[PDB]
PDB file of C-alpha atoms and ligand atoms in Angstrom:
ATOM      1  CA  UNK A   1     -35.584  24.713   6.649  1.00 35.59           C
ATOM      2  CA  UNK A   2     -31.902  24.015   7.305  1.00 36.35           C
ATOM      3  CA  UNK A   3     -30.745  27.640   7.014  1.00 31.82           C
ATOM      4  CA  UNK A   4     -33.940  29.575   7.737  1.00 33.63           C
ATOM      5  CA  UNK A   5     -32.239  32.306   9.773  1.00 31.95           C
ATOM      6  CA  UNK A   6     -29.290  32.652   7.386  1.00 30.73           C
ATOM      7  CA  UNK A   7     -31.508  32.802   4.290  1.00 30.26           C
ATOM      8  CA  UNK A   8     -33.656  35.482   5.931  1.00 28.29           C
ATOM      9  CA  UNK A   9     -30.585  37.555   6.805  1.00 30.79           C
ATOM     10  CA  UNK A  10     -29.422  37.107   3.210  1.00 30.57           C
ATOM     11  CA  UNK A  11     -32.842  38.134   1.887  1.00 30.97           C
ATOM     12  CA  UNK A  12     -33.019  41.236   4.091  1.00 29.02           C
ATOM     13  CA  UNK A  13     -29.442  42.357   3.425  1.00 31.03           C
ATOM     14  CA  UNK A  14     -29.912  41.905  -0.328  1.00 30.23           C
ATOM     15  CA  UNK A  15     -33.227  43.783  -0.237  1.00 29.83           C
ATOM     16  CA  UNK A  16     -31.839  46.750   1.700  1.00 32.43           C
ATOM     17  CA  UNK A  17     -28.560  46.874  -0.243  1.00 29.79           C
ATOM     18  CA  UNK A  18     -30.277  46.703  -3.639  1.00 26.93           C
ATOM     19  CA  UNK A  19     -32.668  49.448  -2.526  1.00 26.72           C
ATOM     20  CA  UNK A  20     -30.036  51.826  -1.136  1.00 28.39           C
ATOM     21  CA  UNK A  21     -27.511  51.698  -3.987  1.00 30.19           C
ATOM     22  CA  UNK A  22     -29.369  50.133  -6.957  1.00 34.32           C
ATOM     23  CA  UNK A  23     -25.938  49.539  -8.531  1.00 33.03           C
ATOM     24  CA  UNK A  24     -24.785  45.924  -8.296  1.00 31.37           C
ATOM     25  CA  UNK A  25     -21.206  47.250  -8.607  1.00 33.21           C
ATOM     26  CA  UNK A  26     -21.380  48.274  -4.929  1.00 34.34           C
ATOM     27  CA  UNK A  27     -19.547  45.034  -4.092  1.00 37.49           C
ATOM     28  CA  UNK A  28     -16.344  46.345  -5.678  1.00 38.67           C
ATOM     29  CA  UNK A  29     -16.611  49.680  -3.864  1.00 38.84           C
ATOM     30  CA  UNK A  30     -16.943  47.791  -0.575  1.00 39.52           C
ATOM     31  CA  UNK A  31     -13.932  45.604  -1.392  1.00 42.50           C
ATOM     32  CA  UNK A  32     -11.873  48.731  -2.106  1.00 42.30           C
ATOM     33  CA  UNK A  33     -13.233  50.551   0.951  1.00 40.92           C
ATOM     34  CA  UNK A  34     -12.730  47.677   3.403  1.00 42.20           C
ATOM     35  CA  UNK A  35      -9.187  47.095   2.134  1.00 40.72           C
ATOM     36  CA  UNK A  36      -8.456  50.791   2.674  1.00 43.37           C
ATOM     37  CA  UNK A  37      -9.711  50.628   6.268  1.00 41.16           C
ATOM     38  CA  UNK A  38      -7.426  47.658   6.929  1.00 41.19           C
ATOM     39  CA  UNK A  39      -4.476  49.495   5.377  1.00 39.62           C
ATOM     40  CA  UNK A  40      -5.263  52.648   7.362  1.00 36.77           C
ATOM     41  CA  UNK A  41      -5.414  50.629  10.593  1.00 39.44           C
ATOM     42  CA  UNK A  42      -1.932  49.151  10.187  1.00 37.22           C
ATOM     43  CA  UNK A  43      -0.482  52.468   8.999  1.00 37.36           C
ATOM     44  CA  UNK A  44      -1.802  54.067  12.195  1.00 37.40           C
ATOM     45  CA  UNK A  45      -0.043  51.388  14.259  1.00 35.50           C
ATOM     46  CA  UNK A  46       3.120  52.163  12.265  1.00 38.24           C
ATOM     47  CA  UNK A  47       3.221  55.701  13.675  1.00 41.80           C
ATOM     48  CA  UNK A  48       4.010  54.364  17.182  1.00 41.04           C
ATOM     49  CA  UNK A  49       6.023  51.140  16.608  1.00 40.75           C
ATOM     50  CA  UNK A  50       9.106  51.205  14.383  1.00 42.96           C
ATOM     51  CA  UNK A  51       8.846  47.648  13.046  1.00 42.53           C
ATOM     52  CA  UNK A  52       5.117  46.904  12.892  1.00 40.65           C
ATOM     53  CA  UNK A  53       5.395  46.339   9.113  1.00 43.79           C
ATOM     54  CA  UNK A  54       8.150  43.703   9.314  1.00 44.26           C
ATOM     55  CA  UNK A  55       5.959  41.032   7.722  1.00 44.95           C
ATOM     56  CA  UNK A  56       5.352  43.274   4.698  1.00 45.84           C
ATOM     57  CA  UNK A  57       6.747  46.782   4.198  1.00 43.82           C
ATOM     58  CA  UNK A  58       4.346  47.562   1.333  1.00 41.49           C
ATOM     59  CA  UNK A  59       0.821  48.954   1.838  1.00 44.24           C
ATOM     60  CA  UNK A  60      -1.028  48.206  -1.403  1.00 45.96           C
ATOM     61  CA  UNK A  61      -4.279  46.904  -2.860  1.00 50.26           C
ATOM     62  CA  UNK A  62      -3.745  44.353  -5.636  1.00 52.87           C
ATOM     63  CA  UNK A  63      -6.676  43.114  -7.732  1.00 51.10           C
ATOM     64  CA  UNK A  64      -6.326  40.071  -9.990  1.00 51.34           C
ATOM     65  CA  UNK A  65      -8.738  38.280 -12.321  1.00 52.43           C
ATOM     66  CA  UNK A  66      -8.978  34.572 -13.168  1.00 53.62           C
ATOM     67  CA  UNK A  67     -11.387  34.177 -16.084  1.00 55.60           C
ATOM     68  CA  UNK A  68     -10.595  30.460 -16.371  1.00 58.62           C
ATOM     69  CA  UNK A  69     -11.327  29.602 -12.725  1.00 60.55           C
ATOM     70  CA  UNK A  70     -14.009  32.351 -12.589  1.00 61.12           C
ATOM     71  CA  UNK A  71     -12.297  34.044  -9.632  1.00 61.44           C
ATOM     72  CA  UNK A  72     -11.809  37.644  -8.509  1.00 58.23           C
ATOM     73  CA  UNK A  73      -9.021  38.402  -6.024  1.00 57.30           C
ATOM     74  CA  UNK A  74      -8.673  41.630  -4.024  1.00 57.12           C
ATOM     75  CA  UNK A  75      -5.502  41.465  -1.915  1.00 54.38           C
ATOM     76  CA  UNK A  76      -4.409  44.134   0.556  1.00 52.98           C
ATOM     77  CA  UNK A  77      -1.483  44.278   2.976  1.00 52.93           C
ATOM     78  CA  UNK A  78      -3.567  45.807   5.770  1.00 53.32           C
ATOM     79  CA  UNK A  79      -3.831  44.781   9.398  1.00 55.60           C
ATOM     80  CA  UNK A  80      -5.097  41.284   8.593  1.00 58.66           C
ATOM     81  CA  UNK A  81      -7.230  39.158  10.879  1.00 57.83           C
ATOM     82  CA  UNK A  82      -6.499  36.685  13.644  1.00 55.67           C
ATOM     83  CA  UNK A  83      -8.147  33.273  13.661  1.00 55.13           C
ATOM     84  CA  UNK A  84     -10.639  34.394  16.317  1.00 56.04           C
ATOM     85  CA  UNK A  85     -11.800  37.263  14.084  1.00 55.08           C
ATOM     86  CA  UNK A  86     -12.500  34.850  11.220  1.00 53.94           C
ATOM     87  CA  UNK A  87     -14.439  32.573  13.582  1.00 55.35           C
ATOM     88  CA  UNK A  88     -16.734  35.458  14.531  1.00 53.57           C
ATOM     89  CA  UNK A  89     -16.822  36.856  10.955  1.00 52.40           C
ATOM     90  CA  UNK A  90     -20.278  38.477  11.053  1.00 50.66           C
ATOM     91  CA  UNK A  91     -22.015  36.338  13.695  1.00 53.75           C
ATOM     92  CA  UNK A  92     -24.910  35.572  11.328  1.00 54.41           C
ATOM     93  CA  UNK A  93     -23.147  32.665   9.580  1.00 55.58           C
ATOM     94  CA  UNK A  94     -23.306  29.277  11.285  1.00 55.34           C
ATOM     95  CA  UNK A  95     -20.323  26.973  11.658  1.00 58.04           C
ATOM     96  CA  UNK A  96     -20.323  24.179   9.092  1.00 55.77           C
ATOM     97  CA  UNK A  97     -22.481  21.227  10.104  1.00 51.13           C
ATOM     98  CA  UNK A  98     -23.936  22.803  13.252  1.00 48.90           C
ATOM     99  CA  UNK A  99     -27.672  22.823  12.485  1.00 44.38           C
ATOM    100  CA  UNK A 100     -26.017  41.453  20.344  1.00 40.76           C
ATOM    101  CA  UNK A 101     -22.343  41.027  19.476  1.00 40.40           C
ATOM    102  CA  UNK A 102     -23.277  39.877  15.962  1.00 36.33           C
ATOM    103  CA  UNK A 103     -25.640  42.794  15.280  1.00 36.64           C
ATOM    104  CA  UNK A 104     -22.757  45.214  15.861  1.00 34.42           C
ATOM    105  CA  UNK A 105     -20.738  43.172  13.356  1.00 35.40           C
ATOM    106  CA  UNK A 106     -23.471  43.426  10.707  1.00 36.55           C
ATOM    107  CA  UNK A 107     -23.481  47.186  11.236  1.00 39.21           C
ATOM    108  CA  UNK A 108     -19.802  47.595  10.377  1.00 40.92           C
ATOM    109  CA  UNK A 109     -19.275  44.828   7.797  1.00 38.62           C
ATOM    110  CA  UNK A 110     -22.717  43.589   6.714  1.00 39.34           C
ATOM    111  CA  UNK A 111     -23.010  45.676   3.548  1.00 38.60           C
ATOM    112  CA  UNK A 112     -19.447  44.816   2.556  1.00 37.98           C
ATOM    113  CA  UNK A 113     -19.948  41.078   2.950  1.00 36.78           C
ATOM    114  CA  UNK A 114     -23.495  40.510   1.700  1.00 40.33           C
ATOM    115  CA  UNK A 115     -23.127  42.804  -1.325  1.00 41.98           C
ATOM    116  CA  UNK A 116     -20.530  40.328  -2.602  1.00 42.28           C
ATOM    117  CA  UNK A 117     -23.317  37.746  -2.921  1.00 41.04           C
ATOM    118  CA  UNK A 118     -25.010  39.954  -5.516  1.00 42.19           C
ATOM    119  CA  UNK A 119     -22.387  38.777  -8.037  1.00 41.19           C
ATOM    120  CA  UNK A 120     -20.781  35.808  -6.277  1.00 40.40           C
ATOM    121  CA  UNK A 121     -21.794  32.420  -4.887  1.00 38.80           C
ATOM    122  CA  UNK A 122     -18.960  31.968  -2.359  1.00 42.87           C
ATOM    123  CA  UNK A 123     -16.466  34.263  -0.613  1.00 43.93           C
ATOM    124  CA  UNK A 124     -13.037  33.018   0.500  1.00 39.37           C
ATOM    125  CA  UNK A 125     -10.945  35.067   2.946  1.00 40.58           C
ATOM    126  CA  UNK A 126      -7.197  34.485   3.311  1.00 41.63           C
ATOM    127  CA  UNK A 127      -5.737  36.644   6.069  1.00 38.64           C
ATOM    128  CA  UNK A 128      -2.594  36.981   8.176  1.00 40.61           C
ATOM    129  CA  UNK A 129      -2.389  39.028  11.380  1.00 42.63           C
ATOM    130  CA  UNK A 130       0.848  40.085  13.048  1.00 39.49           C
ATOM    131  CA  UNK A 131       0.449  37.870  16.136  1.00 42.32           C
ATOM    132  CA  UNK A 132      -1.187  34.852  14.487  1.00 40.52           C
ATOM    133  CA  UNK A 133      -1.008  32.227  11.734  1.00 37.12           C
ATOM    134  CA  UNK A 134      -2.261  32.655   8.168  1.00 35.95           C
ATOM    135  CA  UNK A 135      -5.697  31.064   7.726  1.00 40.48           C
ATOM    136  CA  UNK A 136      -8.174  30.431   4.912  1.00 43.07           C
ATOM    137  CA  UNK A 137     -11.861  31.159   5.532  1.00 45.76           C
ATOM    138  CA  UNK A 138     -14.764  30.392   3.203  1.00 47.52           C
ATOM    139  CA  UNK A 139     -18.537  30.758   3.314  1.00 48.52           C
ATOM    140  CA  UNK A 140     -21.660  30.740   1.155  1.00 46.71           C
ATOM    141  CA  UNK A 141     -23.560  33.118   3.491  1.00 46.30           C
ATOM    142  CA  UNK A 142     -25.094  29.994   5.062  1.00 45.10           C
ATOM    143  CA  UNK A 143     -22.222  28.052   6.650  1.00 40.41           C
ATOM    144  CA  UNK A 144     -18.518  28.760   7.046  1.00 39.24           C
ATOM    145  CA  UNK A 145     -15.277  26.866   7.624  1.00 38.84           C
ATOM    146  CA  UNK A 146     -11.866  28.121   8.762  1.00 39.77           C
ATOM    147  CA  UNK A 147      -8.584  26.372   7.971  1.00 39.48           C
ATOM    148  CA  UNK A 148      -4.913  26.800   8.792  1.00 38.60           C
ATOM    149  CA  UNK A 149      -3.196  27.598   5.492  1.00 41.62           C
ATOM    150  CA  UNK A 150      -0.918  24.702   4.431  1.00 42.67           C
ATOM    151  CA  UNK A 151       1.234  27.133   2.422  1.00 43.69           C
ATOM    152  CA  UNK A 152       2.223  28.940   5.619  1.00 44.96           C
ATOM    153  CA  UNK A 153       2.767  32.688   5.908  1.00 45.33           C
ATOM    154  CA  UNK A 154       2.791  33.661   2.237  1.00 42.42           C
ATOM    155  CA  UNK A 155       0.955  36.983   2.639  1.00 40.24           C
ATOM    156  CA  UNK A 156       3.434  38.347   5.187  1.00 39.77           C
ATOM    157  CA  UNK A 157       0.566  40.485   6.484  1.00 41.29           C
ATOM    158  CA  UNK A 158      -2.838  41.389   5.090  1.00 37.84           C
ATOM    159  CA  UNK A 159      -5.943  39.831   3.586  1.00 38.97           C
ATOM    160  CA  UNK A 160      -7.069  38.357   0.267  1.00 39.66           C
ATOM    161  CA  UNK A 161     -10.754  38.372  -0.670  1.00 39.69           C
ATOM    162  CA  UNK A 162     -11.603  35.778  -3.332  1.00 38.99           C
ATOM    163  CA  UNK A 163     -15.083  35.780  -4.884  1.00 41.11           C
ATOM    164  CA  UNK A 164     -16.206  32.847  -6.998  1.00 41.69           C
ATOM    165  CA  UNK A 165     -18.465  34.637  -9.442  1.00 38.90           C
ATOM    166  CA  UNK A 166     -21.863  33.657 -10.744  1.00 36.47           C
ATOM    167  CA  UNK A 167     -22.160  32.824 -14.427  1.00 33.12           C
ATOM    168  CA  UNK A 168     -24.349  35.922 -14.816  1.00 36.16           C
ATOM    169  CA  UNK A 169     -21.554  38.175 -13.498  1.00 36.65           C
ATOM    170  CA  UNK A 170     -18.682  36.736 -15.551  1.00 36.47           C
ATOM    171  CA  UNK A 171     -18.267  40.088 -17.311  1.00 36.28           C
ATOM    172  CA  UNK A 172     -16.515  41.588 -14.264  1.00 37.69           C
ATOM    173  CA  UNK A 173     -13.457  39.425 -15.054  1.00 34.58           C
ATOM    174  CA  UNK A 174     -12.507  41.130 -18.316  1.00 38.14           C
ATOM    175  CA  UNK A 175      -9.640  43.591 -18.098  1.00 38.04           C
ATOM    176  CA  UNK A 176     -11.252  46.738 -19.512  1.00 38.68           C
ATOM    177  CA  UNK A 177     -14.373  46.348 -17.373  1.00 38.28           C
ATOM    178  CA  UNK A 178     -12.554  45.690 -14.097  1.00 42.50           C
ATOM    179  CA  UNK A 179      -9.996  48.430 -14.778  1.00 44.57           C
ATOM    180  CA  UNK A 180     -12.595  51.130 -15.465  1.00 49.15           C
ATOM    181  CA  UNK A 181     -14.607  50.038 -12.418  1.00 48.01           C
ATOM    182  CA  UNK A 182     -11.607  50.201 -10.072  1.00 49.98           C
ATOM    183  CA  UNK A 183     -10.742  53.648 -11.443  1.00 51.56           C
ATOM    184  CA  UNK A 184     -14.228  54.913 -10.551  1.00 50.06           C
ATOM    185  CA  UNK A 185     -14.111  53.809  -6.893  1.00 46.98           C
ATOM    186  CA  UNK A 186     -10.520  54.875  -6.170  1.00 44.00           C
ATOM    187  CA  UNK A 187     -10.395  58.705  -6.143  1.00 41.97           C
ATOM    188  CA  UNK A 188     -10.952  58.700  -2.351  1.00 41.66           C
ATOM    189  CA  UNK A 189      -8.378  56.038  -1.367  1.00 40.06           C
ATOM    190  CA  UNK A 190      -5.022  57.179   0.039  1.00 42.18           C
ATOM    191  CA  UNK A 191      -3.356  53.880  -0.939  1.00 43.10           C
ATOM    192  CA  UNK A 192      -2.113  52.685  -4.345  1.00 41.60           C
ATOM    193  CA  UNK A 193      -4.470  50.235  -6.051  1.00 40.51           C
ATOM    194  CA  UNK A 194      -2.993  47.979  -8.736  1.00 43.53           C
ATOM    195  CA  UNK A 195      -4.750  45.731 -11.252  1.00 43.09           C
ATOM    196  CA  UNK A 196      -3.081  42.731 -12.891  1.00 44.93           C
ATOM    197  CA  UNK A 197      -3.208  43.909 -16.512  1.00 46.21           C
ATOM    198  CA  UNK A 198      -1.451  43.013 -19.754  1.00 46.12           C
ATOM    199  CA  UNK A 199       0.808  45.232 -21.862  1.00 47.30           C
ATOM    200  CA  UNK A 200       2.303  44.718 -25.316  1.00 49.03           C
ATOM    201  CA  UNK A 201       4.818  39.867 -26.857  1.00 48.33           C
ATOM    202  CA  UNK A 202       2.324  40.409 -24.016  1.00 48.03           C
ATOM    203  CA  UNK A 203       3.611  40.504 -20.435  1.00 48.69           C
ATOM    204  CA  UNK A 204       1.593  40.966 -17.248  1.00 45.82           C
ATOM    205  CA  UNK A 205       2.399  43.326 -14.379  1.00 46.21           C
ATOM    206  CA  UNK A 206       0.779  45.476 -11.703  1.00 44.97           C
ATOM    207  CA  UNK A 207      -0.820  48.545 -13.301  1.00 43.28           C
ATOM    208  CA  UNK A 208      -1.648  51.315 -10.830  1.00 46.83           C
ATOM    209  CA  UNK A 209      -5.095  52.862 -11.321  1.00 45.83           C
ATOM    210  CA  UNK A 210      -5.097  55.798  -8.872  1.00 45.18           C
TER     211      UNK A 210
HETATM  212  C1  LIG B 301     -15.685  41.173   3.345  1.00 46.05           C
HETATM  213  O1  LIG B 301     -14.274  41.433   3.381  1.00 46.05           O
HETATM  214  C2  LIG B 301     -13.973  42.249   4.430  1.00 46.05           C
HETATM  215  O2  LIG B 301     -14.820  42.699   5.201  1.00 46.05           O
HETATM  216  C3  LIG B 301     -12.628  42.604   4.523  1.00 46.05           C
HETATM  217  C4  LIG B 301     -12.009  43.089   3.376  1.00 46.05           C
HETATM  218  O3  LIG B 301     -12.788  43.173   2.264  1.00 46.05           O
HETATM  219  C5  LIG B 301     -10.674  43.470   3.369  1.00 46.05           C
HETATM  220  C6  LIG B 301      -9.953  43.350   4.549  1.00 46.05           C
HETATM  221  O4  LIG B 301      -8.640  43.693   4.640  1.00 46.05           O
HETATM  222  C7  LIG B 301     -10.545  42.866   5.710  1.00 46.05           C
HETATM  223 CL1  LIG B 301      -9.602  42.739   7.160  1.00 46.05          CL
HETATM  224  C8  LIG B 301     -11.888  42.494   5.708  1.00 46.05           C
HETATM  225  C9  LIG B 301     -12.442  42.003   6.891  1.00 46.05           C
HETATM  226  C10 LIG B 301     -13.064  43.129   7.720  1.00 46.05           C
HETATM  227  C11 LIG B 301     -13.361  42.634   9.138  1.00 46.05           C
HETATM  228  N1  LIG B 301     -12.617  42.917  10.203  1.00 46.05           N
HETATM  229  C12 LIG B 301     -13.193  42.315  11.242  1.00 46.05           C
HETATM  230  C13 LIG B 301     -14.280  41.674  10.806  1.00 46.05           C
HETATM  231  N2  LIG B 301     -14.386  41.862   9.490  1.00 46.05           N
HETATM  232  C14 LIG B 301     -15.456  41.338   8.599  1.00 46.05           C
HETATM  233  C15 LIG B 301     -15.236  40.021   8.185  1.00 46.05           C
HETATM  234  C16 LIG B 301     -15.753  39.606   6.960  1.00 46.05           C
HETATM  235  C17 LIG B 301     -15.564  38.302   6.519  1.00 46.05           C
HETATM  236  C18 LIG B 301     -14.859  37.399   7.306  1.00 46.05           C
HETATM  237  C19 LIG B 301     -14.344  37.808   8.531  1.00 46.05           C
HETATM  238  C20 LIG B 301     -14.535  39.113   8.971  1.00 46.05           C
END
C-alpha cells in the first residue's frame, strides 16, 4: 500500500534480472563494472586537464569485507557523484517520508542497483565529486535519504558502495569466496582491483586480483 509503485519496480527488476543471468553473483559483476565506468570517466577527463586528479591521484577499486557488521564495501576513486546526482539516483525511489527522465536512469543503472537487492537489504552510497561536497546516500529500494558527510572529504574523489547483506548471503563475506569471485569478473577491467585480504602473525593489506 505505502510503496506499491516501488515494490512493483523491485518485483519486475528482480524477475527480469533473475531470468537474464540466473546467477545471483551478478551483483558483484555490476559493482565491478560500474566502478570501472566511473574510473574510465575520470581518466578520460584527465587527458585534457592536467590536475583533474588532485583530490586523489590513484585510480583503483578496493573491496573490503566486514563479517562482524555484515557489510560489503566496494570503493573506487572514479568520477564520483554530486549531491544532485544522488537525489535523482534512479528516479524510481521516493524521498523518505513523501508518501521519462527516470526510465532513462533505469536503463543505464537499473540492473546494477536492483541486482544488489538479491543479496542485500540496504545499499549505502558514499561519493565525492570534484566540484561538490562528500555525501552519504542510503536506500532500501523503497525510500532514500541523502546526508552531508560529517567526516568531510575523506574519499578525496570517488564512490563507496556499501551493501548490508542478508543473513542468507553471509557467505559472500569470507575471504576465499570473495577473492575467487572478484578474480572471475575482473579479466575485462583496465583498472587494478584490490581485496582486503590477510597474509601470514597475520597482517592485512590490499591484495591485487587482476
Ligand atoms: C549502484 O552503484 C552504482 O551505480 C555506482 C557504482 O556501483 C560505482 C560508482 O562509482 C558509481 Cl558513480 C555508481 C553510481 C552510478 C551512477 N551515476 C549516475 C547515476 N548513477 C546510479 C546511481 C545509483 C545509486 C545512487 C545514485 C546513482
